[PDB]
Amino acid sequence: SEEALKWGESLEKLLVHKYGLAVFQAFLRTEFSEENLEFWLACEDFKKVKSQSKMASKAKKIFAEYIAIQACKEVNLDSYTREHTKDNLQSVTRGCFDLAQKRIFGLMEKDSYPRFLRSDLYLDLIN
Numbered sequence: 001s002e003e004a005l006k007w008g009e010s011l012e013k014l015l016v017h018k019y020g021l022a023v024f025q026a027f028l029r030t031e032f033s034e035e036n037l038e039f040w041l042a043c044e045d046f047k048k049v050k051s052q053s054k055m056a057s058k059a060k061k062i063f064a065e066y067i068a069i070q071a072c073k074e075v076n077l078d079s080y081t082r083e084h085t086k087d088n089l090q091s092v093t094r095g096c097f098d099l100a101q102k103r104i105f106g107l108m109e110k111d112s113y114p115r116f117l118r119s120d121l122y123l124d125l126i127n
Helices: 003-007 011-015 018-030 034-046 052-067 079-088 098-117
Strands: none
Touching: 003 011, 003 018, 011 018, 011 098, 018 034, 018 098, 034 052, 034 098, 052 079, 079 098
16 A cells, blocks of 8 residues: 555655555545635746746746636635735736745645545555
8 A cells, every 4th residue: 555655744855756646636636626726736847937938928838827816727716815926917026926835735734634634535555
């Protein structure tokens, strides 16, 4: 089982495992919150982008899909974080989504992650 037990250490540790990510994703999908994780993962790709022109258009892409009110993949963000993020689009740097990313990290860590650890998808893998 073994690898699975490592996802139970913390959400930080689940999130760097290929297969934990795939299973956690399936779980989040059963409660219709899988866009939290997808957004979070898009923030991590974004922070790997080298090019400034690439950084700026990728950030613009992320905003239109996950952040903008009525976005197909709209994540639960407040006016404070939503506006902050929107402001950051004028001069993109790699801190652009830190606030948004931490808010959404926080929701998974506290809410859906413990629920995952109580799920059959999770437990059937450790026994």
